[PDB]
Paper text:
TULP3 is an adapter protein that mediates the interaction between IFT-A and membrane-embedded or -associated cargos. We determined the cryo-EM structure of IFT-A in complex with TULP3 to gain insights into ciliary transport. We co-purified the IFT-A–TULP3 complex for cryo-EM analysis and found an extra density next to IFT140 and IFT122 which is corresponding to TULP3. We excluded IFT139 to simplify structural determination, as it is not involved in TULP3 interaction. The final resolution of the TULP3-binding region reaches an overall resolution of ~3.6 Å by focused refinement, allowing confident modeling of the complex. We resolved the N-terminal region of TULP3 encompassing residues 19–54 with a helix (residues 19–44) and a loop (residues 45–54); the tubby domain is not resolved due to flexibility. The electrostatic surface representation showed that the helix-docking surface is negatively charged, and the loop-binding interface has mixed chemical properties with both hydrophobic and hydrophilic residues. By stably expressing wild-type (WT) and helical/loop mutants of TULP3 in a Tulp3 KO IMCD3 cell line, we monitored the ciliary levels of ARL13B (a palmitoylated cargo) and GPR161, whose ciliary transportation is dependent on TULP3.18,22,23,54,55 We determined that mutations in the TULP3 helical region (K41A/K42A/R43A), loop region (F47D/V49D) or a combination of both (K41A/K42A/V49D) could significantly disrupt TULP3–IFT-A interaction and reduce ARL13B and GPR161 trafficking to cilia.
Cilium assembly and maintenance require multi-subunit intraflagellar transport (IFT) protein complexes: IFT-A and IFT-B, which form repetitive structures known as the IFT trains. IFT-A is also essential for transporting key membrane or membrane-associated proteins, such as GPCRs, ion channels and lipidated proteins, into cilia. For biochemical and structural characterization, we co-expressed and purified the human IFT-A complex, which contains six polypeptides: IFT144 (WDR19), IFT140, IFT139 (TTC21B/THM1), IFT122, IFT121 (WDR35) and IFT43, with IFT144–IFT140–IFT122 and IFT139–IFT121–IFT43 forming the “core” and “peripheral” subcomplexes, respectively.
Author numbering:
A (entry chain B): 870 to 993
B (entry chain C): 561 to 895
C (entry chain E): 407 to 422, 427 to 438, 447 to 459, 483 to 507, 511 to 518, 521 to 566, 571 to 584, 586 to 589, ...
The structure:
């Protein structure tokens, strides 16, 4: 909470996670992802989702909620892949220049379109 | 026909013939489908021939060599408006709205400072699928329950689905249904009907799309008729409404049939509710129905039976028989 | 002069002498007006009841045409007569009065002699249509108002200063009072600050006294003339009659007698806490206005269960979907606040958000409204999580308003400028 009131929220989430917190860590991490998705930082959105995925699987170490957390793990992993993919497309259609090779954008776009048929995660 | 050359103007094209210049305006993206709309007219000095249009200036050659300029009547907002008056700005606002010139419309509304003028601009901006600029307008109007809604559906990319949403926000539900049934997620039209409380169309749309809503929307429609007053078609729907998983829902439909038919002449066919009642709650609701139709028959019965059992004393004071009242006198909390 | 004005049976007469028959909308010491006969008055008070006169001579009640019936007081001079419905109350300034029934051929005493002083001068007297309710005790008027229940035979006194009802608004004193010409339980009062405010009450035997309406006197109005469905009628300061539709009855002015009766039933069950009776009474009325009205009743009574069916009947599908979504939210005040936002009352929504403690929702609410600055307040002190995000949205808006210096600034504060 010292980092939190000091606005060091990334480190704060890391702290709660390392501190056995499983109510503060998840809530602050979801809030951070929502902030990242709100802006154009889709790559950070993907990385935070990835952290959620592995942390939630760690929480699923508890046999009580194994069934109701493997689902969350799989869902967040898929979201992580999708957003890290979509970051390149977001950059490509905004900057006056281009960074990636055409082959890579082609492959990314095809994978996205064949993994996002009818439901669009926020921002995509 | 000279198309509009100015970069920011989408699709305007004055046609022109002899002593007139019309100001047609294409409309690619609207809720009601695409169409072409006349915006106005003008007049051209005799012996002239248009060559170019740009922001409204119809560079037109004369019958001698010199290119005179004209000003379209339809595009008159270009100049300042301190000279213009409210009675002069209002039609100017309408013209700018037709031309899809939203920036000038915003400027002129800011000058006018009329709430209804801003509201008209907002309705136009919804009508043309301009979600962002409509949000900008509403955020100034102050209307909050629509700012949040529009910010909610700003993500939608599907053309017909977005069309249906922006239709619903313009309180045209029929066209909303029409578009939603063409979008990727038709069940949204269902959701609209079910929220909008028109359960008959809810059944129609659901049956074609979802079968899970069928018994539950049937139950809701039956209850709608029951609170309204009908109790025959309501009972029939209740029969239709019985599911096989939600014992709550199931016995609820059973109680429905019980009460609606009991209101009908069914002391024999609502006589089931003497038995069909699966909860003391059901019994006491039947006690309400058995103070409903001037019962001795089964005011007597359900106040002798139900958790409303002391009530049999009044159910039987209605009658002569004192067995119930006297025997219940120990089993009563109202001396 | 005192300007003696009266209102009865949709007829308003004020000394000038303007008489308005508002049913047909025709405008032409005391004056009394009915539909057919207008009484100008040796009496402290006189009245026509069809062809009858209520002459109060010495300690007696007399009748003559245009000597028919006689009534005997044993009790001082009455100087108060009031005919409403088919009942008359004849009141004195000596804490004495009676109620005489009129449904028969002649005046007959429905209630016996009484003394207010035993139960509690009298300022003014009025009656209900049913006549079971008969008052301002006193020569200046007093804050307390007394009501004598004929049937159960006691008295009820309501104190303006204390807001308390004794069975046998704190700086206002009742000065004038009238009754509705259709509902015996509907009572109204004009109270002047010791400025002038009009208080309408519903007298429920099973519940007591209820606060129905409380609105300040109109600027064009100076005295409370009375009411008749669906308008509060006042004397206009120099048509000299001002009719104000009742707050619940806004929009049902041209509805039928039975439609207005249903609206009255809803209004009564609103005066009581029976939302259920109110709604079940209003089940065959297709005007969006009524549903909107009880759909702010729901707001004022944190009862969303019946709300959902309502804003269906009103065509406000947007709001219904909003409620459906907000149902996810884990709070009770929160859903009510969302509902209120959907139905034209931002301020109450702000209040319930404040009390709910769901400050992040308050933040979004201010952002939705043009409260772009209050938003930064709630972000600065309460969320500290959307502060980056609140700053960002503000920067975006600033870019939207074509001001790209403050926009740069908030880009840099949000750390997104990069």
């Amino acid at each position: 909470q010292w980092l939190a009131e000091n606005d060091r929220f990334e480190e704060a989430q890391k702290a709660f996670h390392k501190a056995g917190r499983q109510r503060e860590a998840v809530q602050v991490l979801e809030q951070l992802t929502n902030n990242a998705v709100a802006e154009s930082r889709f790559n950070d959105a993907a990385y935070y989702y990835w952290m959620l995925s592995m942390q939630c699987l760690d929480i699923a170490q508890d046999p009580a909620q194994k069934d109701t957390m493997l689902g969350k793990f799989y869902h967040f992993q898929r979201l992580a892949e999708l957003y890290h993919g979509y970051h390149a497309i977001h950059r490509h259609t905004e900057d006056p220049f281009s960074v990636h090779r055409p082959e890579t954008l082609f492959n990314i776009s095809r994978f996205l379109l064949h993994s996002l048929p009818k439901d669009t995660p926020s921002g995509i | 026909v000279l198309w509009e050359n100015w970069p920011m103007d989408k699709g305007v094209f004055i046609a022109y013939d002899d002593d007139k210049v019309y100001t047609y305006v294409f409309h690619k993206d609207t809720i009601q489908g695409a169409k072409v709309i006349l915006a106005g007219s003008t007049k051209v000095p005799f012996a002239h021939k248009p060559l170019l249009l740009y922001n409204g200036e119809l560079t037109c050659q004369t019958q001698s060599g010199k290119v005179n300029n004209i000003y379209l009547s339809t595009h008159g907002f270009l100049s300042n408006l301190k000279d213009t008056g409210p009675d002069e700005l209002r039609p100017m606002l309408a013209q700018n709205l037709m031309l899809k010139r939203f920036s000038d419309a915003w400027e002129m509304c800011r000058i006018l400072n009329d709430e209804a003028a801003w509201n008209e601009l907002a309705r136009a901006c919804l009508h043309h699928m301009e979600v962002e600029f409509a949000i900008r307008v509403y955020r100034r109007i102050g209307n909050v329950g629509i700012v949040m809604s529009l910010e909610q559906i700003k993500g939608i990319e599907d053309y017909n689905l977005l069309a249906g949403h922006l239709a619903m926000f313009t309180n045209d539900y029929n066209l909303a249904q029409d578009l939603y049934l063409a979008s990727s997620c038709p069940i949204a039209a269902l959701e609209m009907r079910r929220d909008l409380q028109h359960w008959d169309s809810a059944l129609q749309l659901a049956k074609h799309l979802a079968p899970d809503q069928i018994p539950f929307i049937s139950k809701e429609y039956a209850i709608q008729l029951e609170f309204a007053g009908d109790y025959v078609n309501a009972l029939a729907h209740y029969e239709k409404g019985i599911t096989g998983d939600n014992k709550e829902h199931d016995e609820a439909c059973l109680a429905g049939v019980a009460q609606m038919s009991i209101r009908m002449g069914d002391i024999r066919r609502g006589v089931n509710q003497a038995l069909k009642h699966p909860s003391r709650v059901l019994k006491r609701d039947c006690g309400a129905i058995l103070e409903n139709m001037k019962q001795f028959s089964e005011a007597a019965q359900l106040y002798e039976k139900g958790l409303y059992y002391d009530k049999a004393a009044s159910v039987y004071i209605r009658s002569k028989n004192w067995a119930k009242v006297g025997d219940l006198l120990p089993h009563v909390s109202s001396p | 002069r005192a300007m003696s004005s009266h209102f009865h049976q949709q007829v308003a007469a004020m000394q000038v002498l303007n008489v308005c028959f508002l049913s047909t909308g025709v405008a032409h010491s005391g004056v009394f007006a009915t539909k057919d006969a207008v009484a100008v008055w040796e009496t402290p008070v006189l009245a026509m009841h069809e062809e009858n006169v209520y002459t109060v001579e010495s300690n007696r009640v007399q009748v003559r045409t245009w000597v028919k019936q006689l009534l005997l007081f044993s009790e001082g001079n009455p100087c108060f007569l009031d005919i409403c419905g088919n009942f008359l109350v004849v009141g004195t300034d000596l804490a004495h009065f009676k109620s005489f029934d009129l449904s028969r051929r002649e005046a007959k005493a429905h209630c016996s002699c009484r003394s207010l002083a035993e139960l509690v001068g009298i300022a003014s007297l009025r009656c209900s249509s049913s006549g079971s309710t008969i008052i301002l005790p006193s020569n200046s008027p007093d804050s307390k108002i007394c009501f004598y229940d004929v049937e159960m035979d006691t008295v009820t006194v309501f104190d303006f200063k204390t807001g308390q009802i004794d069975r046998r608004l704190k700086n206002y004193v009742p000065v004038n009072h009238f009754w509705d010409q259709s509902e015996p339980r509907l009572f109204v009062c004009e109270a002047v600050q010791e400025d002038v405010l009009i208080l309408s009450f519903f007298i429920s035997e099973e519940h007591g006294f209820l606060l129905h309406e409380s609105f300040p006197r109109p600027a064009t109005s100076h005295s409370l003339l009375g009411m008749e469905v669906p308008y509060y009628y006042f004397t206009r300061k120099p048509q000299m009659v001002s009719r104000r539709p009742l707050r619940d009855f806004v929009g049902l002015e041209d509805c039928d007698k039975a439609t207005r009766d249903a609206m009255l039933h809803f209004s009564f069950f609103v005066t009581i806490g029976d939302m259920d009776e109110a709604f079940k009474s209003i089940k065959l009325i297709k005007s969006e206005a009524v549903w909107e009205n009880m759909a702010r009743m729901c707001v004022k009574t944190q009862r969303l269960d019946v709300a959902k069916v309502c804003l269906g009947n009103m065509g406000h599908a947007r709001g219904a979907r909003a409620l459906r979504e907000a149902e996810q939210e884990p709070e009770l005040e929160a859903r009510v606040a969302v509902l209120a936002t959907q139905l034209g009352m931002l301020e109450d929504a702000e209040q319930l958000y404040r009390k709910c403690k769901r400050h992040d929702l308050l933040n979004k609410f201010y952002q939705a409204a043009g409260r772009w600055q209050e938003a930064l307040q709630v972000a600065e002190h309460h969320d500290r999580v959307h502060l980056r995000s609140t700053y960002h949205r503000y920067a975006g808006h600033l870019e939207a308003s074509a001001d790209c210096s403050r926009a740069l600034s908030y880009y840099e504060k949000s750390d997104t400028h990069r």
